[PDB]
Amino acid sequence: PCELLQDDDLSESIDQWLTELTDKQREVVIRRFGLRGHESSTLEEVGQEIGLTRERVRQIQVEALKRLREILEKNGLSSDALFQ
Amino acid sequence: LVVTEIDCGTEHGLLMSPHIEGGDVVEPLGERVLGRVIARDVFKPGSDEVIVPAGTLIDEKWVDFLEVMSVDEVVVRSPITCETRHGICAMCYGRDLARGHRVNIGEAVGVIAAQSIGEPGTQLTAADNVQVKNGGTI
Amino acid sequence: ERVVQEDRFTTIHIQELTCVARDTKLGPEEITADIPNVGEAALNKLDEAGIVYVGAEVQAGDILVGKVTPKGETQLTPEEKLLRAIFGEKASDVKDTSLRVPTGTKGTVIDVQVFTRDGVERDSRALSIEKMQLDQIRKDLNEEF
Amino acid sequence: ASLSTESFISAASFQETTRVLTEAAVTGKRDFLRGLKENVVVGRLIPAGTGLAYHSERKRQRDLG
Amino acid sequence: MLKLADLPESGQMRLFDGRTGNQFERPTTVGYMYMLKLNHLVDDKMHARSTGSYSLVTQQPLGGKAQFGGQRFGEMEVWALEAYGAAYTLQEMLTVKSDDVNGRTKMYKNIVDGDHRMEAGMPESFNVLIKEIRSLGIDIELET
Amino acid sequence: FLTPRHIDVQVVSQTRAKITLEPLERGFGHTLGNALRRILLSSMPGCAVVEAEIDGVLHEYSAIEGVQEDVIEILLNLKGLAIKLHGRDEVTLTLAKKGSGVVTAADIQLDHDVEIINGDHVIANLADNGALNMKLKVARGRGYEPADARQSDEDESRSIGRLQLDASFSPVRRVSYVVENARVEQRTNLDKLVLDLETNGTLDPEEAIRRAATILQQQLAAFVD
Amino acid sequence: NEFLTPRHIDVQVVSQTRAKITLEPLERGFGHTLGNALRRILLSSMPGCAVVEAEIDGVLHEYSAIEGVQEDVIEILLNLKGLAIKLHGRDEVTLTLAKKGSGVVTAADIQLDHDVEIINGDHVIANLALNMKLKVARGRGYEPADARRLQLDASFSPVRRVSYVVENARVEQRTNLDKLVLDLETNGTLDPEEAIRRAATILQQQLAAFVD
Amino acid sequence: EFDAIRIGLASPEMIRSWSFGEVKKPETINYRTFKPERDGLFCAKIFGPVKDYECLCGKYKRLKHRGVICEKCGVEVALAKVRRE
Amino acid sequence: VKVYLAIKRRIQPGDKMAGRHGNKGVVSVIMPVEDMPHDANGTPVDIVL
Amino acid sequence: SVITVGPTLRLHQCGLPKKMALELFKPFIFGKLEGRGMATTIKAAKKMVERELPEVWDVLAEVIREHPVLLNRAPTLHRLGIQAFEPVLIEGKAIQLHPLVCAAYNADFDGDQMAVHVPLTLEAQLEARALMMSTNNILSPANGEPIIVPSQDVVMGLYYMTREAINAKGEGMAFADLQEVDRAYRSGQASLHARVKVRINE
Amino acid sequence: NHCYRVVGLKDTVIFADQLMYTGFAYSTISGVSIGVNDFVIPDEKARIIN
Amino acid sequence: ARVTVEDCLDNVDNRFELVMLATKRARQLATGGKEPKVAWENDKPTVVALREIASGLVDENVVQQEDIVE
Ligand SMILES: [Mg+2]
Ligand SMILES: [Zn+2]
Ligand SMILES: [Zn+2]
Incomplete structure (x- = not known):
């Protein structure tokens, strides 16, 4: 029962952290990774309908990745100790 | 055999008498009628007098009260002569429990009575002329 | 307090722990040095072959023998894939099934005995065991002569 | 006196299983969960003790109003 | 031998108290006695667990996780709980704490939330008995 | 009064x-x-030997060559020493002897602030085919403290080299x-x-x-x- | 040296x-x-301070009671041990008490000097339906009557x-x-x-x- | 809830209502791959899928559709607890 | 590859101690030296049966 | 775990090791850390109870104050074999049991093991405190004789206290009340059993 | 059994704990011990055996 | 100012309705629905429900009335 609760509590927090992180950057991470029920797509398939470029969708990905990296550090997730 | 009724309403019980075997008594009346309800109205050994007008339960105070009078034969309501269906009345059952009050409505008295017998089981394994010891009448 | 300070009833227990190398159709198991999803503190007491040094003080939950098991068709979830790109963790397709000491058992390794089969390659840790056994069987026979 | 149990789940504990289930099959007796040994195998509340108030409300609201 | 070693004849000498400091008003038998140490230490018998792995057919806790081992709740402890007025205690140790699938997962969330809802659930020891009876050509159903 | x-x-x-x-x-x-x-x-x-580091052995269980007594018996003899520290709180002592001669408490190198009371206390027996050399470290404490309670001065690298003792001064x-x-x-x-x-x-x-x-x-x- | x-x-x-x-x-x-x-x-x-000597009129023995008093002579000495007397002027003085009225005899009727101070004045001594001579002193330890006619225990x-x-x-x-x-x-x-x-x-x- | 547990005879017309498929082949798992086969003692069409929300051939594996039947393999996607019922 | 650990299990409250005459016993606590009864010489006892 | 007698415990409470209370009340710690605000998610709270920090012991004792745990021996022949106690955080690896309650369990201290049980539902915590408590089952269910009786060690100190002697130190004196008997005895001037006379307010 | 019947349960549990506290404190003051001189063999035992 | 679990059992003389009455009362305090009459002494929700039974401030009628109100 402990392992089944960690996967459920983390899934309810990942989708919640994306809706409170930003507005324009939230739809880019959801399009690259289908965490809200969407289907996974490549960089050329996602960029053909949004951004109209192959490098504009990757520049926002690294910026939003560094922002979520600082959230998990100050929240108390301690990723440096889990992955070691 | 869980208790489901508070009282049946009948008067059917066996007589209780102390152990008068041998020369002296073994168990007096104060221990065999300790915590049991009285079936019928006990009468004084005199001409015509009543002690218990309703026949309620006997507490520790009524035990010493019977030692004042010379009463020796009393009747009590036992669970072997009850009147309920699929159970045992609370009034017909005694009051010997972990508490000091009467039994409750819903207490499983059938399990606590079987464990009390099987628990001490591990601890278990000429006359030509007779005479008297205490002087008295015949 | 005089019976504990004087070290009277303090006995010594010797508990052994053996590790095996199973052979499966998905891939052979070998004793390696690199372990997925670990750090420098976990590999500090370990050598370059995957065997704990002789005399290293180990705690409850340390890695003694490095044993990895290859696997295929992991079918990872999209929630776990999102975390593999943030912290920069590579997707290791080999599961970590190394030997670890149980909880509440801590001590000091006195010796390590290895066993190899015919036609199998050996590591640098087994070379130091046969060298100490060959030097001992040669220094003592030269001294008794 | 222990072989006169109307239930089959409480009679299959000490007696033979194939002897109680065979008689209960050819008879078709719909047995209820009244008692103490029946609710232990099933997993419901026990009427003895604090569970008497639960079975009283269940029987009251059953084709009675 | 007590006379040669400058010791009392009866072997009982009065000792002084360590905490209060007074003298005991009775002779105490002292001396040296050989004692042993058995291999029944508490490091091999003390263990506890809350969650762990379960079997395949019967959802019962067992070892294998190198954490601890669950104890058996035999029938002797069942008759003891029925002797009291315990109804929800015995029902908890038979349905929620063991032999369940949805009841154990839903109960663990109630402990973290702070309110004990005590969901009913269904014991897994009886669901297996239904599938084994229906496969023997004998019918069983719930009339409700 | x-x-x-x-x-x-x-x-x-x-x-x-x-x-x-x-x-x-x-x-x-x-x-x-x-x-x-x-x-x-x-x-x-009081003062006693807290830890002892030997540059010839890895752990305290394995014995060494040349010494008659076991290494465990050597560490059990260091507890009986009586070292007096006047000014310094923590000092490091050395010990080294080669040859067929028994080692005692007086074999430790003298210091200006370290004074050992007993001198007839033996430590171990030596021989001609072996020798010993170790470094002693004492400290000032108040009461009894085991080796598992005073977990300090460690860097996850001195496990095979340094050996700790039971401070029972x-x-x-x-x-x-x-x-x-x-x-x-x-x-x-x-x-x-x-x-x-x-x-x-x-x-x-x-x-x-x-x-x-x-x-x-x-x-x-x-x-x- | 931290504690x-x-x-x-x-x-x-x-x-x-x-x-x-x-x-x-x-x-x-x-x-x-x-x-x-x-x-x-x-x-x-x-x-502290307590009563060291207690003498009354007709001190024959410990069991010999006195007439005119409804209470026994043993209970009279037991009520004087609980009396709280505190003085600081002189080291050892001698008190007196003369009660002629009946009904009750309380401790507040005891004639006190400028140095003798009584804490509890509501404590009863004996019931009368008598004249005694008591003496108080300053003591350090609890000394019984066996250590060192009239004799009674003292509790300083x-x-x-x-x-x-x-x-x-x-x-x-x-x-x-x-x-x-x-x-x-x-x-x-x-x-x-x-x-x-x-x-x-x-x-x-x-x-x-x-x-x- | 439930009450009044009864016992009767298993009618031939009622057994067909409990079952979901007919078992005709005795083989269970293929030799090379570790996957069940149709009309077997461990088949996925009759009893249910092996994994959670995934068919046999792997065509439908999303977590959106709770109940659906794949066109390639006639198996209804569900959880792992349906295989016991 | 097998290893060998060396654990020194000191005595603690909970272990079983007995003699040669058949008197089992579980140790309760470890009392200090000042609390043990001592004779007129000053030798505190260790085991109190 | 192995049982151990403790003379410094009350009749309604017992002892419990610190390492056992962390494994039994593990789901109760995760609920207190999230409500307080120290742990955000449930995954971060798992690494706090396994790291043995200094703040996990203060939050642990909050759920042990009022939580009747169950105790039972291996052979259960009566209803008094399963009694509920209040656990107290003690240091060691043994269960500190009450000396007087050992008469009901019929267990001696020679290596016996008693299992524990932790009720989760609050409905089970109320029926364990009002029914399964050690203070409620003070009378044996067999007869009217109480099951909580002073054992051999307690009755030995009470028999020597109430004894008659012909000659003793301090015999023949009188005391004002019970406060004077305790002061004269502990002062070393009166014997433990001497023929005296006192007046009490009963 | 008489204290619980005439007083109650709240004052009986506290009385049972204070009776155990005064039973262990006074048992340590009196250092009772069994020895070889406590087994008093009767001098007339040899007369009956002979 | 102490726990009184024995005086409350003598009022009902059942020891079974007291558990059912304290269960429905403890859930109203753990969920934050109602406020207890007795002040808080750093106690939990299960033991505080038994303090109101011995004092007579709550009964089978107050618990039923606390559920309809809001
Ligand atoms: Mg035993
Ligand atoms: Zn009847
Ligand atoms: Zn398919």
């Missing part, structure tokens, strides 16, 4: 020493005697007090204390009473404030 | 004569050393019942520490809280001469 002044220290031996403080009032003699006995055994300044071993009678020609209820102190030699019996007086006064001061 | 110094968090005062103190932070072997050292000073040898100690229970205390730093719980019971001549500060001062004065 009476206070102990100018106590007497009757030193009959290096280890056993008796002291007679002063003829006190009746009632306070037996009270102060049992009170001072529990202080000399609870907390007293206790300068006081046996304390005995009796109630005698004395005459002062002032009152009739007079009694003195005769403390039979048994010190291993790490501390002087005169300073033992002074160090046991400031600790009791610090505990009784909480009632005033 | 845990106790601090009184609260003083449980249940009555004017009965108190209860607690010392949470203590050492390992100090929870019972300070309790026994303070108990022997308050109980055995505590400076202000406190009556002194006890202490040593129980463990949960500390965030140390896992094994015990606390001290002291309780006193006096006859009202001294504050139960101030009596502890007086006993600790006597024990401190006997050691400050050999400390620095």
Whole structure:
């Protein structure tokens, strides 16, 4: 029962952290990774309908990745100790 | 055999008498009628007098009260002569429990009575002329 | 307090722990040095072959023998894939099934005995065991002569 | 006196299983969960003790109003 | 031998108290006695667990996780709980704490939330008995 | 009404020493005697070998070549040493001897602030085919402390090199007090204390009473404030 | 040389004569050393004042009673031991009491001088349906009648019942520490809280001469 | 809830209502791959899927559709607890 | 590859101690030296049966 | 775990090791850390109870104050074999049991093991405190004789206290009340059993 | 059994704990011990055997 | 100011309705629906429900009335 609760509590927090992180950057991470029920797509398939470029969708990905990296550090997730 | 009724309403019980075997008594009346309800109205050994007008339960105070009078034969309501269906009345059952009050409505008295017998089981394994010891009448 | 300070009833227990190398159709198991999803503190007491040094003080939950098991068709979830790109963790397709000491058992390794089969390659840790056994069987026979 | 149990789940504990289930099959007796040994195998509340108030409300609201 | 070693004849000498400091008003038998140490230490018998792995057919806790081992709740402890007025205690140790699938997962969330809802659930020891009876050509159903 | 002044220290031996403080009032003699006995055994300044590092062995279980006694028996002999630290709190000592000669407590290199009481205490037996060399490290503590409680001064790299010991230093071993009678020609209820102190030699019996007086006064001061 | 110094968090005062103190932070072997050292000073040898001599008219024996009094002669000596008398002027004085009226004889009718002060004036002595000569002095320890006609026991100690229970205390730093719980019971001549500060001062004065 | 547990005979017309498929082949798992086969003692069409929300051939594996039947393999996607019922 | 650990299990409250005459016993606590009863010489006892 | 007698415990409470209370009350710690605000998610709270920090012991004792745990021996022949107690955080690896309650369990201290049980539902905590408590089952269910009786060690100290002697120290004196008997005895001037006369207010 | 019947249960549990506290404290003051001199063999035992 | 679990059992003389009455009362305090009459002494929700039974401040009628109100 402990392992089944960690996967459920983390899934309810990942989708919640994306809706409170930003507005324009939230739809880019959801399009690259289908965490809200969407289907996974490549960089050329996602960029053909949004951004109209192959490098504009990757520049926002690294910026939003560094922002979520600082959230998990100050929240108390301690990723440096889990992955070691 | 869980208790489901508070009282049946009948008067059917066996007589209780102390152990008068041998020369002296073994168990007096104060221990065999300790915590049991009285079936019928006990009468004084005199001409015509009543002690218990309703026949309620006997507490520790009524035990010493019977030692004042010379009463020796009393009747009590036992669970072997009850009147309920699929159970045992609370009034017909005694009051010997972990508490000091009467039994409750819903207490499983059938399990606590079987464990009390099987628990001490591990601890278990000429006359030509007779005479008297205490002087008295015949 | 005089019976504990004087070290009277303090006995010594010797508990052994053996590790095996199973052979499966998905891939052979070998004793390696690199372990997925670990750090420098976990590999500090370990050598370059995957065997704990002789005399290293180990705690409850340390890695003694490095044993990895290859696997295929992991079918990872999209929630776990999102975390593999943030912290920069590579997707290791080999599961970590190394030997670890149980909880509440801590001590000091006195010796390590290895066993190899015919036609199998050996590591640098087994070379130091046969060298100490060959030097001992040669220094003592030269001294008794 | 222990072989006169109307239930089959409480009679299959000490007696033979194939002897109680065979008689209960050819008879078709719909047995209820009244008692103490029946609710232990099933997993419901026990009427003895604090569970008497639960079975009283269940029987009251059953084709009675 | 007590006379040669400058010791009392009866072997009982009065000792002084360590905490209060007074003298005991009775002779105490002292001396040296050989004692042993058995291999029944508490490091091999003390263990506890809350969650762990379960079997395949019967959802019962067992070892294998190198954490601890669950104890058996035999029938002797069942008759003891029925002797009291315990109804929800015995029902908890038979349905929620063991032999369940949805009841154990839903109960663990109630402990973290702070309110004990005590969901009913269904014991897994009886669901297996239904599938084994229906496969023997004998019918069983719930009339409700 | 009476206070102990100018106590007497009757030193009959290096280890056993008796002291007679002063003829006190009746009632306070037996009270102060049992009170001072529990202080000399609870907390007293002492020094002992905390850890020992040998550059020829990995762990304490395996024996070495040339020494008759086992390594475990060597570490059990270091606990019986009596090292006195005057100024320094923590000092590092060395020991090295080669040849067919037994090693004792006097084989340690002398220091200006390190004074060892016993010199006849043996450590291990040597031979001609082997030799020993190790480094000792002592410290100043208050009471008994095991090796698993004082987990400090570690970097996850000195596991195979450094070996820790069980710090069980206790300068006081046996304390005995009796109630005698004395005459002062002032009152009739007079009694003195005769403390039979048994010190291993790490501390002087005169300073033992002074160090046991400031600790009791610090505990009784909480009632005033 | 660091130690845990106790601090009184609260003083449980249940009555004017009965108190209860607690010392949470203590050492390992100090929870019972300070309790026994303070108990022997308050109980055995505590400076106070009580009755040392009691003489009445017709002191034949201990069992020989006196006529005119409804109470026995044994209960008269038992009521004088509980009387709280406190004087500071002279070291040893002699009191008197002459009661001619019947009904009741109380302790407030005793003629006191400028130095003799009585704490409890409502304490009854004997019931009359008599003239005695008592004497009080200053004593240090509880001395019975066997030590050193007229003779009776004396109780110069202000406190009556002194006890202490040593129980463990949960500390965030140390896992094994015990606390001290002291309780006193006096006859009202001294504050139960101030009596502890007086006993600790006597024990401190006997050691400050050999400390620095 | 439930009550009044009864026992009767298993009618031939009622057994067909409990079952969901007919078992005709005795083989269970293929030799090379570790996957069940149709009309077997461990088949996925009759009893249910092996994994959670995944068919046999792997065509439908999303977590959106709770109940659906794949066109390639006639198996209804569900959880792992349906295989016991 | 097998290893060998060396654990020194010191005595603690909970172990079983007995003699040669058949008197089993579980140790309760470890009392200090000042609390053990001592004779007139000053030798505190270790085991209190 | 192995049982151990403790003379410093009350009749309604017992002892419990610190290492066992962390494994039994593990789901109760995760609920207190999230409500307080120290732990955000449930995954971060798992690494706090396994790291043995200094703040996990203060939050642990909050759920042990009022939580009757169950105790039982291996052979259960009566209803008094399963009694509920209040656990107290003690240091060690043994269960500190009450000396008087050992008469009901019929267990001696020679290496016996007693299992523990932790009720989760608050409905089970109320029926364990009002029914399964050690203070409620003070009378044996067999007869009217109480099951909580002073054992051999307690009755030995009470028999020597109440004894008659012909000659003793301090015999023949009188006392004012019970407060004078305790002061004269602990002062070393009166014997433990001496023929005296006292007046009490009963 | 008489204290619980005439007083109650709240004052009986506290009385049972204080009776155990005063039973262990006074048992340690009286150092009762069994020895070889406690087994008093009667001098007339040899007369009956002979 | 202490727990009284024995005086409340003598009022009902059942020891079974008291558990059912304290269960419905403890859930109203753990969920934050109602406020207890007795002040808080750093106690949990299960033991505080038994303190109101011995004092007579709550009965089978107050618990039923606390559910309809909001
Ligand atoms: Mg046993
Ligand atoms: Zn009936
Ligand atoms: Zn398919």
